[PDB]
């Protein structure tokens with residue numbers, strides 16, 4: 604049956620018709636990452652320290668915060684950049700995924716317990732629209748899907764887990780793989796699985812980022828100490844492929860680039876879609892191996908364990924900060940609940 608994400612990705616990358624991993628671009632990105640390796644952008648602390656919307660505390664509240672956001676961590680792109688969902692929070696302005704986090708903090712500050720399953724298990728579509736309200740005329744995408752998943756997720760947390768994601772965390776016994784597995788098996792919307800060449804492959808974008816984010820928000824300590832944190836892969840979404848294609852690590856075929864430039868919508872499980880995700884996932888594994896080797900070849904001792912989580916976080920932010928520079932190669936478009 605099921606290949607795990609890393610195995611899935613290797614298999615996809617090796618049998619890919621429309622997407623290509625370019626060793627030269629793998630080298631480049633590794634070296635761009637090397638010069639940054641001592642800075643907060645490739646430390647676990649950077650998750651809090653570079654993102655003011657992320658929770659400060661390492662408590663049950665923060666953990667449940669990470670849960671609700673990674674539960675809804677899918678599909679923020681809009682049809683045009685002039686015409687998107689924006690949320691204002693404490694006099695600052697956020698679009699995309701950050702507009703979700705703003706929306707959450709905004710609700711918490713209003714006093715609505717949006718990070719509590721007791722609440723979001725029975726929250727209405729009308730309430731959800733309210734909480735996620737935009738400050739432009741344009742709504743966040745798939746709000747109906749965000750409502751349905753909240754209700755399903757809340758119920759399951761209240762029934763199986765005492766209404767707290769901290770309980771799920773503790774049950775994983777400091778294993779990131781077990782936490783990822785528990786999540787995938789307990790919460791339907793996280794089942795980020797499809798087909799390729801007649802084998803079941805897995806990506807687990809949201810499940811993996813949820814584990815990474817649990818790790819980050821608890822600062823790699825306590826219930827968020829994970830002995831096996833380096834086993835987590837990148838989180839295969841639509842932005843990380845874009846920024847790997849920009850930097851020269853990923854190459855797309857004529858036909859694929861055709862779709863991307865015209866804004867033609869991909870479907871979840873389309874081969875080309877699957878190939879982009881799988882190749883991206885494997886691409887990052889290769890950049891990580893390159894970087895570690897470069898760090899070795901300069902006879903160094905890093906001050907923290909570099910892993911595929913941290914590279915992903917970095918490259919995602921890079922995506923965000925350098926959007927204008929990437930116009931030339933668009934991100935692939937899809938509407939699904941998985942990313």
Ligand SMILES: Nc1nc2[nH]cc(CN[C@H]3C=C[C@H](O)[C@@H]3O)c2c(=O)[nH]1
Nearest residue numbers: 650700838840843915916917919920
């Ligand atoms: N691949 C990927 N997909 C994603 N969707 C949403 C996020 C949001 N994560 C944020 C927290 C730390 C990261 O630097 C990023 O600012 C994300 C990602 O960090 N990576």
